[PDB]
A paper describes a structure:
Plasma kallikrein (pKal) proteolytically cleaves high molecular weight kininogen to generate the potent vasodilator and the pro-inflammatory peptide, bradykinin. pKal activity is tightly regulated in healthy individuals by the serpin C1-inhibitor, but individuals with hereditary angioedema (HAE) are deficient in C1-inhibitor and consequently exhibit excessive bradykinin generation that in turn causes debilitating and potentially fatal swelling attacks. To develop a potential therapeutic agent for HAE and other pKal-mediated disorders, we used phage display to discover a fully human IgG1 monoclonal antibody (DX-2930) against pKal. In vitro experiments demonstrated that DX-2930 potently inhibits active pKal (Ki = 0.120 ± 0.005 nm) but does not target either the zymogen (prekallikrein) or any other serine protease tested.
Inspection of the complex structure reveals the reason why DX-2930 prevents substrate proteolysis by pKal. Namely, the Fab interface covers ∼2400 Å2 of surface and completely obstructs the active site of pKal. The CDR3 loop extends deeply into the active site of pKal and interacts with both the substrate binding region and the catalytic triad. This interaction is preceded on the N-terminal side of the CDR by contacts of both Pro-104 and Arg-105, which abuts the catalytic triad, and directly bonds with Asp-483, with the S3 and S2 substrate binding pockets of pKal, respectively. Finally, Glu-108, which is predominantly acidic/polar in the most inhibitory affinity maturation variants, contacts Lys-575 of pKal in an interaction that is likely to be a significant driver of DX-2930 specificity with respect to other serine proteases, most of which have a Gln or Glu at this position. However, the orientation of the HV-CDR3 loop in DX-2930 prevents interactions with subsites S1′-S3′, and thereby it prevents its cleavage by the pKal catalytic serine.
Residue numbers in the entry:
A (entry chain A): 391 to 629
B (entry chain H): 1 to 138, 143 to 223
C (entry chain L): 1 to 212
């Protein structure tokens, strides 16, 4: 996150860190807890390492430096990548992760609500993006979970800044005209949440973008409301 | 970050073969086009080979087509360049480079290695002959050392064991048609100093383990 | 092959200048053009891709434009870190690099001090004669050096070497080395190095006679 500030315990209790352990262990992506046994993230997080065994998922965590050899983590039982997602591209950039065991809820580990069928035409005005990504282009993974407030833009505005790509109705974009606040590398797969009628809703999944916090260069997010039939089918069907 | 480290460079004879490796380290979800690029001494960058996807199109510049083979061992996370029927003109620094496939994800389009030196020559390893460039009999005077007929690079030159540095110019070496290198090192000093001051060039050539000190005097 | 031509080949500038470099392709490459910076002895660094997109981490003073066959790189305000060689690269079909544009430090004209050195006796007895002409601490780089043996202009038997811009005074130095067999050397009397350069109100000649 560029231009953000430190989050607090309990502030974003759905935020998870998806890490890979080979010889060394590294944070690769964010994700969002959406049920006891379900995390929602970006499909692209699995382009390089598509197999489940190397992944470790940390929840109820503020500071990555708190992780030690003994820190408990969830494991991946199933990765469900959208059937129309193409590796390395921006369409249908969404994946469900089923955990090997269900997690209990606490005030520091609980789910983000998904958008409601009633809120199809809602214009969201208090939106935030979180993660442990770089605080500048070619920076470093941040220790304490960062947060930043970013306004949504229209798809037409977003398309003006991405002439080489197609912005679709299944994407949503967010950014400031003069830049300065944005997601960056390592935030991908994490949440874009907006507070509507007193509750937080998962509106986006951090997906792609050119640079970080550049002027007239919004971030692109998978628009979660457009995948609700798919989420409910894949989850209900699995359990 | 994702990082690339080349190895396998060295000295080979014309007609010989050599295999370069480029080992990738780090974790990433990105896929990459993988290239080898080279740069001959004092020349521009020249792309020579690439592989566009896993077991995909392998392609070659005409300058190396039929002699070089590019490949990947994904289990070792390593890119190779097998070079056969090598020639003098293949002498260069070789770089591996990765280029990002697909949409930008707050990340880099290019990743480059550090480079590895390949020298193709039939020359025999030999320390330089050092000859004086004597200050002329006819303000400021110039003198030097001609450091001739050595192989391979590099040599180092100092003056008065490192005590004289101001106004020294050691020229880049030139590859002669013989296949041996030559350079001069010069220095400008006061004319009034030529009679009283001692000037000695110290020429070291690690490859032949030779050190030569040569006194440079008015003729 | 798609051939890439950069212009100019060298350009002189000062910190704070706006600098523009051009790259031409022999056929259309759409917008599949990248720009690189390279310093001596180092791997190149990507600046710009798809003609005008800024690479991750690259300062915003760098920008690019063009499509088809003619492209420019612009540095809006040159910084000390920016003196380097710049290469364009087409990636329409494989990769091809341009020949490069060196961006060097501009300063006032400075004439070379010119010195000629005869071959040593030590070297002669081994059968080869090296005659060295030194042009010391000059600016700009462009300089013509001609060898004359008994007034006959030499050709094909000399090699030049040049230093990088001096870190103190931003000048160049250059050597021209004429190589002859001992036999040929001994066949002639007058050995002359003639240099032409902007800092000289007319060409300067330094010489010696064999054996004086």
């Amino acid at each position: 996150i560029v231009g953000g500030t430190e989050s607090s315990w309990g502030e974003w209790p759905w935020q998870v860190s998806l890490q890979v352990k080979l010889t060394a262990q590294r944070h690769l992506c964010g994700g969002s807890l959406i049920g006891h046994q379900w995390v929602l993230t970006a499909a692209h997080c699995f382009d390089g390492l598509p197999l489940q065994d190397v992944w470790r998922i940390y929840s109820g965590i503020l500071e990555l430096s708190d992780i030690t050899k003994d820190t408990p983590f969830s494991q991946i039982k199933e990765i469900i990548i959208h059937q129309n997602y193409k590796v390395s591209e921006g369409n249908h950039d969404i994946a469900l992760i089923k955990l090997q065991a269900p997690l209990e809820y606490t005030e520091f580990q609980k789910p983000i609500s998904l958008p409601s069928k009633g809120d199809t035409s809602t214009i969201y005005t208090n939106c935030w993006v979180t993660g442990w990504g770089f605080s500048k282009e070619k920076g470093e993974i941040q220790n304490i979970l960062q947060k930043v407030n970013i306004p949504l833009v229209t798809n037409e505005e977003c398309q003006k800044r991405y002439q080489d790509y197609k912005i679709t109705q299944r994407m949503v974009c967010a950014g400031y005209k003069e830049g300065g606040k944005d997601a960056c590398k390592g935030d991908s797969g994490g949440p874009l949440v907006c507070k509507h009628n007193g509750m937080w809703r998962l509106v986006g999944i951090t997906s792609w973008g050119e640079g970080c916090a550049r002027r007239e260069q919004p971030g692109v997010y998978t628009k979660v409301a457009e995948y609700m039939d798919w989420i409910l089918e894949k989850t209900q069907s699995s359990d | 970050e994702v990082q690339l480290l080349e190895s396998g460079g060295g000295l080979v004879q014309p007609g010989g073969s050599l295999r370069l490796s480029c080992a990738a380290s780090g974790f990433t979800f990105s896929h990459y086009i993988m290239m080898w690029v080279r740069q001959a001494p004092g020349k521009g960058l020249e792309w020579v080979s690439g592989i566009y996807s896993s077991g995909g199109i392998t392609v070659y510049a005409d300058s190396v087509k039929g002699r070089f083979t590019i490949s990947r061992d994904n289990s070792k996370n390593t890119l190779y360049l097998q070079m056969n029927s090598l020639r003098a003109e293949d002498t260069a620094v070789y770089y591996c480079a990765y280029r990002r496939i697909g949409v930008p994800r707050r990340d880099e389009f290019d990743i480059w290695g550090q480079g590895t030196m390949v020298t193709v020559s039939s020359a025999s390893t030999k320390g330089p002959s050092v000859f004086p460039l004597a200050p002329s009999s006819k303000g400021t005077a110039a003198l030097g050392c001609l450091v001739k007929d050595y192989f391979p690079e590099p040599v180092t030159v100092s003056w008065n064991s490192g005590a004289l540095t101001s106004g020294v110019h050691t020229f880049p070496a030139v590859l002669q048609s013989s296949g041996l290198y030559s350079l001069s090192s010069v220095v400008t000093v006061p004319s009034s100093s030529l009679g009283t001051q001692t000037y000695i060039c110290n020429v070291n050539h690690k490859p032949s383990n030779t050190k030569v000190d040569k006194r440079v005097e008015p003729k | 092959d798609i051939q890439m031509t950069q212009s100019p080949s060298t350009l002189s500038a000062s910190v704070g200048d706006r600098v523009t470099i051009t790259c031409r392709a022999s056929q259309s490459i759409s917008s599949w053009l990248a720009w690189y910076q390279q310093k001596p002895g180092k791997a190149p660094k990507l600046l710009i891709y798809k003609a005008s997109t800024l690479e991750s981490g690259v300062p915003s003073r760098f920008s690019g434009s063009g499509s088809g066959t003619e492209f420019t790189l612009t540095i809006s305000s040159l910084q000390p870190d920016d003196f380097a060689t710049y290469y364009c690269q087409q990636y329409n079909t494989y990769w091809t690099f341009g020949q490069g544009t060196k961006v060097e430090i501009k300063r006032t004209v400075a004439a070379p001090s010119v010195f000629i050195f005869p071959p040593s006796d030590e070297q002669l007895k081994s059968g080869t004669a090296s005659v060295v002409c030194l042009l010391n601490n000059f600016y700009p780089r462009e300089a013509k050096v001609q060898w004359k043996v008994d007034n006959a202009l030499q050709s094909g038997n000399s090699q030049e070497s040049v230093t990088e811009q001096d870190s103190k005074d931003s000048t160049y130095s250059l050597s021209s080395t004429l190589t002859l067999s001992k036999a040929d050397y001994e066949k002639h009397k007058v050995y002359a190095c003639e240099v032409t350069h902007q800092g000289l109100s007319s060409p300067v000649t330094k010489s010696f006679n064999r054996g004086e």
